[PDB]
Amino acid sequence: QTGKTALAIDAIINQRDSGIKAIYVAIGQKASTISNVVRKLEEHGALANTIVVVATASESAALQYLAPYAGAAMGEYFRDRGEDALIIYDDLSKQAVAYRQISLLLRRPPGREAFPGDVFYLHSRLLERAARVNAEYVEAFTKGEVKGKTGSLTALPIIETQAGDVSAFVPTNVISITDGQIFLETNLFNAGIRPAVNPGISVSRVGGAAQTKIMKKLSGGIRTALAQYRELAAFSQFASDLDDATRKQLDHGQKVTELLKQKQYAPMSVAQQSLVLFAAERGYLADVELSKIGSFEAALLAYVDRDHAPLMQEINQTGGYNDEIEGKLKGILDSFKATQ
């Protein structure tokens, strides 16, 4: 109950207009939950771009265990054709449980938590099918139909820890197999900071080579500002009349923290994210460091849409950044401050 599914299906919903096809695999989910999700997928956007694979908690362990491999075979079809795809595996812990049941009923020798000896080789061989693949491979697979494309299959496995134990066998296996995790802490979620991502423990091993340029330029300081807020949050609890350097830094940290939260089924395009981060990074919030920040963002997004949409088209197309874009973003922010 921290938003693991909410984050994944919002990821799927944001692919409505990218060429990235999407797959949601529901392992051991209860059927009425799946049905509620599927209805949300049609209502808030497109279920046309998503394949839904279902193995409910009432179905046999063999069907649960294999399910994710069947979904990977459906996504591995697009990868080998030259087209990008995104697969979400929901509860790889439930797949591990199903395999444990099958292994024990077949009498196979038990391991650390009764899980079988090859439980690593289950998820390892599942997830290492998620790859980006070169044009030579995709041209030799298709036998010369696509020629200059490079297919890919992005994967987002979901894991549930128990009371946040990160040293349990299945979590530590999957954390070694993958390359970055989005760690969703529970006491941030209880605090209402949803989505409750926890920086510093959540990393991305691929780095900023995956970011587009404008998102890369406007995000470097955010990481440092939140790091500085982590340490200066202890001081904020009980103390005041610190140095104004520190005071400024702490305040800005608390308001960038306030900025990085949003409603569930609102996804945000790169241009909208860009300008909101620019507003935080260039200091246009520094005088607005009060509870209105949510209204400020909604008003800024409405204003930007109303007056300067060809810029939003150009950024949503290119993600480019340069001095002319930097100046235009300044002009837009300067004008918006004069309004509400």
């Binding site: 020798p109 038990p110 391991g111 650390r112 079988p116 000896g117 090859d118 690593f120 080789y121 040293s167 530590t172």
Partner: protein
């Protein structure tokens, strides 16, 4: 390559994965587990690997092994078995990298059990102990300085902080493989050259150079060329 009479390096991308794969194979074969679920032959399967990696009357194999400690627990059997074999420990630090010092090796947490006077020699031993002591003292005075101000520092402690900043910078080095990032030529410092450089900085020669003279500069004789231009 050893039997041809060369000095080889063997890199192991993760030795923990070797141990854990040994657990998986042992569970598939069904043998009763021991300790924290590890295989019954843990120390033997480590010893069979690690004892082949040795110097010999012809050639040698040196090995640099990457080490993952499960659950941060230095007492867990895979760490505890591995550490019996390691002769040295190099720690890489995000903090040191953030300063821009490369290679980002923490000098205080890194160790070697070669670093004893009857093995390494007295001059090297006392130099290395000296640099360790200076950087440790500085690591304490930095806490004070922040807590109060540089005003508190005595003139001696200011000379400690200055020499420590020079030593810390003089640990950085330009690598031949890193030219693209840095654009610098790249250098290979001899053991005597580094011992002389740190001895000089510790005994207070070059106390008249600026600390940016030492950054990425290679040997100390190039530190004075840089300070000549600077």
């Amino acid at each position: 390559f050893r039997d041809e009479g060369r000095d080889v390096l063997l890199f192991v991308d993760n030795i923990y994965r070797y141990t854990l794969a040994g657990t998986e194979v042992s569970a598939l074969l069904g043998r009763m587990p021991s300790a924290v679920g590890y295989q019954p032959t843990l120390a033997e399967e480590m010893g069979v690997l690690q004892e082949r990696i040795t110097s010999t009357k012809t050639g040698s194999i040196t090995s640099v092994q990457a080490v993952y400690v499960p659950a941060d627990d230095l007492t867990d059997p895979s760490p505890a078995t591995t550490f019996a074999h390691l002769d040295a420990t190099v720690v890489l630090s995000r903090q040191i990298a953030s300063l821009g010092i490369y290679p980002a090796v923490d000098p205080l947490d890194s160790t070697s059990r070669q670093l004893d006077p009857l093995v390494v020699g007295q001059e090297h031993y006392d130099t290395a102990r000296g640099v360790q002591s200076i950087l440790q003292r500085y690591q304490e005075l930095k806490d004070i300085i922040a807590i109060l101000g540089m005003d508190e520092l005595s003139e001696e402690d200011k000379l400690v902080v200055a020499r420590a900043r020079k030593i810390q910078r003089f640990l950085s080095q330009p690598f031949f493989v890193a030219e693209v990032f840095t654009g610098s030529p790249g250098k290979y410092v001899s053991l005597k050259d580094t011992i002389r450089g740190f001895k000089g900085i510790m005994e207070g020669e070059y106390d008249h150079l600026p600390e940016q003279a030492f950054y990425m500069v290679g040997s100390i004789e190039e530190a004075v060329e840089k300070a000549k231009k600077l």
